[PDB]
């Protein structure tokens, strides 16, 4: 029931500032310290600091002090982490986490906010169906999918039939095109016998532009 609701994604120019939110639900906000954790390529996982939900003070990891400003809003039960004068090295996933048994462990985490530091404009994707046909069958099985092409920046999340289809689902890591834009694909193996009764919809979410796309993948008569 405890949920930490995060911003998802943020795109910012270098030198700009970003305020990452973490909305607390399913518990009394003032009961637990809020933590911020960075996951960046190379540096990896790093604890940034803990914010006291009572006095509102933060105990920082010296490395992030000044650079990151960690606050706690009791009127909206939201904790915030503000990164000032963004540089390309700041591109990372930012997690908010809490511990429910004193200072023993981090049992609850947010989904993470992917902050991209870039001068380039946000670009929503194209969503093309990868229709099942005679060319995509393997002994009673039919493969189908969605090609999520030409977006910027990361991430894109994909689900099938609003999360109801997960068995045999493969969402591929994004590839970086020669244009600087990203592309990914998401596939599912389903019975070939049920192509005439089931509807398969890929639910595409380009987090940085908040573009939600529900694309029906209809069978091909080829």
């Amino acid at each position: 029931q405890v949920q930490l609701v995060q911003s998802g994604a943020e795109v910012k120019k270098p030198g700009a500032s970003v305020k990452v939110s973490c909305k607390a639900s399913g518990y009394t906000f003032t009961d637990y310290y809020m933590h911020w954790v960075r996951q960046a390529p190379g540096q990896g996982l790093e604890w940034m600091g803990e914010t006291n939900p009572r006095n509102g003070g933060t105990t920082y990891n010296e490395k992030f002090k000044g650079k990151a400003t960690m606050t706690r809003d009791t009127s909206t039960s939201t904790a915030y982490m503000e990164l000032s004068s963004l540089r390309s090295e700041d591109t990372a996933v930012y997690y908010c986490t809490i511990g429910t048994s004193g200072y023993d462990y981090f049992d609850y985490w947010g989904q993470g906010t992917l902050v991209t530091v870039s001068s380039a404009s946000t670009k929503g994707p194209s969503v093309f169906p990868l229709a099942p046909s005679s060319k995509s069958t393997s002994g009673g099985t039919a493969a189908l999918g969605c090609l999520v092409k030409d977006y910027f920046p990361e991430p894109v999340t994909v689900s099938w039939n609003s999360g109801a289809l997960t068995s045999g689902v493969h969402t591929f890591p994004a590839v970086l095109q020669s244009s600087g834009l990203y592309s990914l694909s998401s596939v599912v193996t389903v019975p070939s016998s049920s192509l005439g009764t089931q509807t398969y919809i890929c639910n595409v979410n380009h987090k940085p532009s908040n573009t939600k796309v529900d694309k029906k993948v209809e069978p091909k008569s080829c």
Binding site: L45, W47, S136, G145, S185
Partner: protein, 218 residues
């Protein structure tokens, strides 16, 4: 800061095998209260980390029986009694005894399952994309093992170069396999120059390569 060093960086074990991961702290991690706040977290790609072990040896609630932890002074070990497909990901050790709290660099766990040949599927460009002036052909290699699988795009048997992108999944947490998506993208004008579009698949589990193809316009 306390440096947390994990060994090995990559662990590969066969199904039915135990798994051990070492975590070395560059300094003592005894909190002022006398306890050691050493934790273990499992992270799957594009998922938040999940708590396994806390305070060196205590198994977190809801964590499977097979997981356990130990260690003394600066030496710490994460143990899996028998690896399950659901165990793949990156294991991180973490100290919360001294500020700033620090994580290990992580250990990637891989299941060395029985060789599995890929099932090959091909998708011609959709009718929708063709209206845009671009044509993408997709070749899918599904549920194979090991991850080393080669894709060769052929247009009328002429080996293609410079216009394709591919991506491999993380190891599957149900059957310990990998899947690979390869996309050949050409302008509509370049697409309409060739007839036989084929992806030739080479893999350890395939005695001879698998070629999936279609004729453009068929």
């Amino acid at each position: 800061d306390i440096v947390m060093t994990q060994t090995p960086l990559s662990l590969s074990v066969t199904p039915g095998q135990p798994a051990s991961i070492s975590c070395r702290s560059s300094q003592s991690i005894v909190h002022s209260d006398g306890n050691i706040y050493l934790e273990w977290y499992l992270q799957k790609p594009g998922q938040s980390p999940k708590l396994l072990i806390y305070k060196v040896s205590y198994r977190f609630s809801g964590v499977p029986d097979r997981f356990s932890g130990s260690g003394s002074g600066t030496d710490f070990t994460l143990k899996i009694s028998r690896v399950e497909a659901e165990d793949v990901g990156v294991y991180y050790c973490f100290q919360a005894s001294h500020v700033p709290y620090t994580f290990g660099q992580g250990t990637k766990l891989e299941i060395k399952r029985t060789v599995a040949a890929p099932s090959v599927f091909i998708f011609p460009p959709s009718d929708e994309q063709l209206k845009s002036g671009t044509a993408s052909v997709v070749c899918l290699l599904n549920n194979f093992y090991p991850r080393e699988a080669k894709v060769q795009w052929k247009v009328d048997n002429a080996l293609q170069s410079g216009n394709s992108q591919e991506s491999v999944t993380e190891q599957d947490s149900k059957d310990s396999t990998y899947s690979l998506s390869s996309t050949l993208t050409l302008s509509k004008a370049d697409y309409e120059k060739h007839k036989v579009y084929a992806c030739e698949v080479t893999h350890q589990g395939l005695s001879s390569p698998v070629t999936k193809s279609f004729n453009r316009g068929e």
